[PDB]
Every structure is written in C-alpha cells, then in structure tokens.
Design a protein around this ligand. Sequence first.
Ligand code: 1NW
Ligand code: MG
Ligand code: MG
Length: 560
Amino acid sequence: SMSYTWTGALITPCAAEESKLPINPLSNSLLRHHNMVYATTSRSASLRQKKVTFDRLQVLDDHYRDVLKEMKAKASTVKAKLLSIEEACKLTPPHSAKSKFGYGAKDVRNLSSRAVNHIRSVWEDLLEDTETPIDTTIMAKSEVFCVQPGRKPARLIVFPDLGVRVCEKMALYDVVSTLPQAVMGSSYGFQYSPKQRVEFLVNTWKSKKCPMGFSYDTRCFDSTVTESDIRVEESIYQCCDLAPEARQAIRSLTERLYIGGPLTNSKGQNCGYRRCRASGVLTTSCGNTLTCYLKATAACRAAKLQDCTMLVNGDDLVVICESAGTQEDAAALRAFTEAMTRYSAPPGDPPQPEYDLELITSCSSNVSVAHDASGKRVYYLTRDPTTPLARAAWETARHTPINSWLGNIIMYAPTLWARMILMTHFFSILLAQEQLEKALDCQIYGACYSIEPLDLPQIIERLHGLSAFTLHSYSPGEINRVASCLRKLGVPPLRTWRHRARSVRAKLLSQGGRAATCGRYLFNWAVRTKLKLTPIPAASQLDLSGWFVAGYSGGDIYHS
Ligand SMILES: O=C(Nc1cccnc1)c1cccc(Oc2ccc3c(c2)c(=O)ncn3Cc2c(F)cc(F)cc2F)c1C(F)(F)F
Ligand SMILES: [Mg+2]
Ligand SMILES: [Mg+2]
C-alpha cells in the first residue's frame, strides 16, 4: 500500500515559524556564523512529503517468522498493569498539545472534571468501536540544524487528540515500558545510560575473536512500517497477560490509530491518509525498536552473518559480529541489506563495514577514548558537536520549551566539547543572570524531565563517575572533529574558552553551596593547580533509574 495519500491540502503552521538565528550578544559569543544555523519550517513540508511517500515492498520468509516466534515466546513472560485515568494523567507533559474538546494539558494534570469525563468517553469508545479510523493531526516539526556543504526539510509529526493520547497510556504505558526489554534483553538500547551503552558496546566488541560492526540507516523508517508490521507488533503485545479492557484497547488502537488513519492539518482541512507508522503515538518508539530488531535479526540469518549482536534504539540500529574476512563481510553485509529490503526496510546510506569501533555511529554517537587523572584509559560516549552547538546557540537567543543543552550536558558530560564549551557558556550566563537555581525542562530518550542546574555535579558523577571531571588526552580522531566543528561554526578556540572558564570557575567558588561545588568539579580542567576530587555526598541519593528504562520519543511522556 502507499505510505501516504494526499488530498492536496497544505500542512499548515498554527502560528508563526522562526527560521533564522537572531543576531544576539549572548549567542554571538558562542558562535559567530549565525547564518549557518537554521530551524526547519512548514515551508519545506511538501519536500518531506515527496521523500516519505511511496509504495512499500514486503516479502516475508522463514527466518522472519522463526524470529517473530522467538520474540513472542519471551513476551509471554510479561504481565502488564492497566493504568487508571488518574495515573495516565500524571504522565502528561505540561506543554502537551491541548485537546479539541475544551481542555488542555494543565486541566489533565489537575484532573479537571471536564478533561477527565471526556477521557472516559474516549476510553468507553475504544472498548465499543473496534473499527472507526481515529483522526490525527499532521504538523511540520520545527528543529534546528547547521547548513551542509542544501538544508534538511522538516520532519512531519502525526498525532491523535489528547484524549486518545491519555488512553494509550492507560492501556499501553506499562507494556511499552517493560516488554521491549523482556524481548530483546541486552540488545534494547533505551535501558542503558551513556556509560552503560559504552560498556555494552566495547564489551560486545571485545567478546568477538575478530570484531566487525556496522550501523544501519533505514530510509525514513516510519514510512517503511507496513500494516503487516503494525499487526505483527500487536501480536507481540497480545502475548502479555492483560486486563480485558486493555486487550480490547490495544486491539482498537491498532486498527483505528496505529495501522493508519486520516490526516487533518492545523486548520481542520483533510490532508490525506496514513498507512504507516504514526510518529506521534505512544507505541512509536517501542514498535520501531521491536520491528527493527525483528527484521535485522532475521536479516542476519538470511545473510549468513556470524554471531550478530544487536543494539537497537527505535529505528536506530547497530550490529557487531564475528568477522569472516574483508570480502566475505562485504558480500554478507550486501546480502543483509537485500534481506532487509525485502522486509521493507531499505537503506538510505548503504551500510559500510567497520573494523574500528570508534568509527561506528549508533544513535548519532560513537565510543571514543580518554584518560583519567591516573592515566588509565576511560572509554566514553561522544558525537559530532555541530547539531548540539547550533541548537545551543539557538536556545540561547530564543526562549525554547525544552532546553536541549541541559540534556546534552548531562548525556555528554565527560566529552571534550560539552565540558569546554557547553558547561562554560551556559553557566557564565546562568550566573550573570543569576538563574543558578531555576528548574528547567529537558529531555532524555523522549521523556521530559525537570532539572535543577546546580544538581549537575551529582548527576554527572552518578551517571558517568568522577573520571568525567578529570578526563584528558582525548584521541586525535575526537580532537580533529571538535576542531573542524569549532572552525566551521566560528566558535572561539580552546585558548579562549579556557580563559572564560578560568573565570567562571572562580566566579563560582566565591558563592559556596552547590554552586561552588559546580565550579570545583565541572571546571577542574581549567586550572593547572587542580583539586583532588572526592565522591560527592549528594551523589548517593539520586534515583536515576526511571531515566533509562525505555524510549518515548513522540510518546508524549513526562516523568514527574
Ligand atoms: O580549539 C582548537 N582548534 C581550533 C579553533 C578554532 C579554529 N580552528 C581550530 C583546538 C586546538 C588545539 C587542541 C584542541 O583539542 C584539545 C583541547 C583540550 C584538551 C585536549 C585537546 C586533549 O587532548 N587533552 C586535554 N585537553 C584539556 C582539556 C580537558 F581535558 C577537558 C576540558 F573540558 C577542556 C580542556 F582544555 C582544540 C579543540 F578543538 F578545542 F579540541
Ligand atoms: Mg536501567
Ligand atoms: Mg533514517
């Protein structure tokens, strides 16, 4: 079937869409070349649509079915709790899209009788109507990036009403939170923190006689998801012990929402139909991981690859296996791609076999190596800093809802670039404006979290470990990448930053409390006359488990 059908109606913006970085004093400090940073707008909607509209090709075989059973077996062990309207309401973000029925996120969290009575009807409806397609909205996602030697057309997000969204939580939250792990096990990426992802990646890499690995970029994964897939996915969920209403709920959401449905724009006009994955639903991340894993696993067997270990995060896939030689591997990978193509998951960038782990890129990042105070190697997780910086600049000169810099600092706290640039910049700013003690919302694996800036040192140590404050001697590969990015964007050089940080540090010492703590641990690198860094008392009082349990991108989740 066609992934998308269009009536001709336009994908419209429900306000004003900014596209260029403002020339501001605070931002021009971080990076000068503002004319290299852009935000996607609905103006490029049509272009995306062309790229994401086509006819799927899907042929299944024994390997696929054999793997689907292996997976269903493990799912059977699961028992998923049915959330109550009240619990589901807790999970709704405060910034979540308002309903088309007289209420928004705020009311939902407050349990407003109106918001709640409506949610009930939507539920009662799901249990009664097992066929009527459910409406969804189609918008142009606004994201910021850096120009490439054209530009990236905005991504399109499809999502149902807030009422429907709260019900999805009731029936499938516990499911999409425990099942993917019970099925894929150590291969489920969202269960790991940055430290753990690295551990798993080098531990897997070193467990092979002669390792070979590759990342696999599926071309617009969401559009390749077929009605067949969405149902196979449902069969897996159906293996869970479920409460009657939940089972009926899943059956209906599958047919009415997940496999497809009408598309309405912000103006109420009909846009077309969707016969693929809905990026903005609760089951997106879970289902994409399950589908990707299923196919890739089956593809490995079809391709005769040896001892394949998968690490899947949604549609993001990386594979480490036993090398059979340069020619044998290149032939096998090629077969793998063909098998994946028949499973309706064609490549965008033909997969290239890598023999140097640091060269493999999964979830837009890679495993690199640095050294602790003792000079002992300390493997860690990094990534090109171009996008994080473009967004950083952007977020500085524009009030953004989800500060992605806070998050980027947490996730990449031990990297060269996050420590030298991000930590420095944002703090001297927070301090200058005296915002050191303000809770800010940021994201981690799709879920929205409220974070207090000064609690960073604990968080960092608890997630990464003290070594994150003393790492040095980053590989030459890493340096050259941070070098080019900074050059390209017109970012101040190392010497400039050290001086700035050299100042922010002392700026922080003279205040004590958690503040002086930050200056002491975060900017240790700054001074040559260091300071022995010991375990932070408050580090052991942080329950960051919920932070790394499952994926929720587009799932509209908010962990209180
Ligand atoms: O800025 C540089 N080059 C440039 C700048 C502008 C235009 N074109 C090129 C530039 C110039 C020379 C070296 C360099 O890399 C660096 C910078 C600091 C380094 C290392 C390499 C290292 O191997 N080992 C330790 N440190 C010290 C260090 C650290 F352990 C942690 C930090 F939190 C900050 C910091 F200092 C850079 C880099 F892109 F910043 F990364
Ligand atoms: Mg965990
Ligand atoms: Mg892709």
